[PDB]
């Protein structure tokens, strides 16, 4: 010993429907999400940690925080 946006958007035309509904019936968890993807032992140590750190700064996080703040403020 980039283009991924276009490729991901183009790949999204051929998925089946019945299997999609079947998978949407079975809930996932923190284990099934990454159990089908190969990982490097050095980086698999911090894989859930990084995605959760980036997710706590997501738009949905701001929306839920604002909703909670407005709900608590409404008790005045």
């Amino acid at each position: 010993n980039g283009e991924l946006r276009e490729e991901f958007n183009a790949l999204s035309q051929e998925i089946a429907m019945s299997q999609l509904i079947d998978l949407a019936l079975l809930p996932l968890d923190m284990f099934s999400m990454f159990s089908g993807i190969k990982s490097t032992i050095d980086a698999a140590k911090s894989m859930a940690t990084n995605v959760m750190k980036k997710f706590k700064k997501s738009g949905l996080a701001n929306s839920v925080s604002t909703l909670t703040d407005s709900l608590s403020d409404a008790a005045s």
Binding site: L25, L28, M52, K53, K56, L60, A61
Partner: peptide, 27 residues
């Protein structure tokens, strides 16, 4: 149902702080 993956994602997120603490020791 399958939406639960979102709900857990924001639930245990607090644990990152602990790891972040370790990260600052490793930073």
């Amino acid at each position: 149902m399958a939406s639960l993956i979102y709900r857990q994602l924001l639930t245990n997120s607090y644990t990152v702080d602990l790891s972040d603490e370790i990260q600052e020791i490793g930073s």
